[PDB]
Ligand binder design. Sequence first.
Ligand SMILES: Fc1ccc(CNC[C@H]2CCCO2)cc1
Length: 460
Amino acid sequence: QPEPDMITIFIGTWNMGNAPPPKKITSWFLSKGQGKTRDDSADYIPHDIYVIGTQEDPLSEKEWLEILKHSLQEITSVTFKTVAIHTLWNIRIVVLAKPEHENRISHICTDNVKTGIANTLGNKGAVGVSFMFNGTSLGFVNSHLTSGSEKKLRRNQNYMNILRFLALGDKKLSPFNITHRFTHLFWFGDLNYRVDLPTWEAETIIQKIKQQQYADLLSHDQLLTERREQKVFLHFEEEEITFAPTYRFERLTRDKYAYTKQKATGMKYNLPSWCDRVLWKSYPLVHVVCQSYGSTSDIMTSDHSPVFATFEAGVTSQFVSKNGPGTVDSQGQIEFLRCYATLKTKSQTKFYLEFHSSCLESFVKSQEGENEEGSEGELVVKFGETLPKLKPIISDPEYLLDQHILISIKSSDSDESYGEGCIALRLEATETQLPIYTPLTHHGELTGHFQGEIKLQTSQ
Ligand SMILES: Fc1ccc(CNC[C@H]2CCCO2)cc1
């Protein structure tokens, strides 16, 4: 029975509005409704992994697991195994996998982050799950961010707190936050970003939605504009939106958007918005393709509609050779040549690098670099040909060309990371000096760049 090199992953996000679901929710898991939908000829083909994020979920874990599992069994005639379930308040994540995957899945982690302070602490935040699927690390985050059209900057702050403080994946990757710990990271939820148009335009917006004319609405979507200005979700992807706004509906129909201010809304308007979103970030040159992104039309218990997204994702096998794991393979080496970091910092500490990768027995610390001043005010840290030669555990190019090197640049004075990035070993050539590049971030914001050349020796 061969190991897969690609799996499909279902991501769902649904703010249930504190109401029990209707008796049939299969359209969600089939990616049917509006937007980029799944072909009918695939309806009986199970996804490998289903990740369900809810917000304002009124059900017990047991109640929701029975609904989810019975839904999937009806669609696929497969009884899924529960990988993980984690709930913070009314925010929940469930991961289900085909039974054949049970022994491929290990290192299962869960965590949550509560956002805000005092007044603003007690219902918003995120839950997440991570695990290994054979040689591939997968992370999933369901967040319920701050509500309200005038609170986009709080949502952005909620995002940074979640990526800083959510503790998932390999704890040995100490300089790295969740935006660098996984081959594939999916971040979804009720992100609560709104269409920023004047209140007076509510009926105009409704008109546009009825005509399926979303362009002048998407151009005011706060998540798209904040991303374009690099204020949030830096280096994440989102599929183009081709479905109607998923909030705020009158319950029990989808014919009406309920936008006007009421005591129940704190006297706030809720113009039609794409609150409910799925984004992802995968390591460079790893296969990931969105094959659906849309909303259901027939699940109407909540003031939100469910949102689905599905993905092809590249995965790798748990590689064994006669040498590694348990030793190095001296037919392999990674040389970083003529490298330099460009940093936005004003500090004048010396810096060193750490190289982290599951192709190494343990992380590798460099010598300190040589600081120079850039012509436009920047710090340039030069490493020369001084960098340690990295000794991978396995030299076979079928393994090594699929790996990645995480890089942290750290202050000698504080040992704190000033920037994190990732280099793919999926090179055009071996035994050849080739350019490499990564942006560097810290707490998910841009702090600099790392560039230079690499020379990769494999056993071929
Ligand atoms: F749904 C799931 C999926 C995975 C698991 C954990 N399986 C661990 C692997 C390694 C050791 C033997 O199986 C439980 C439930």
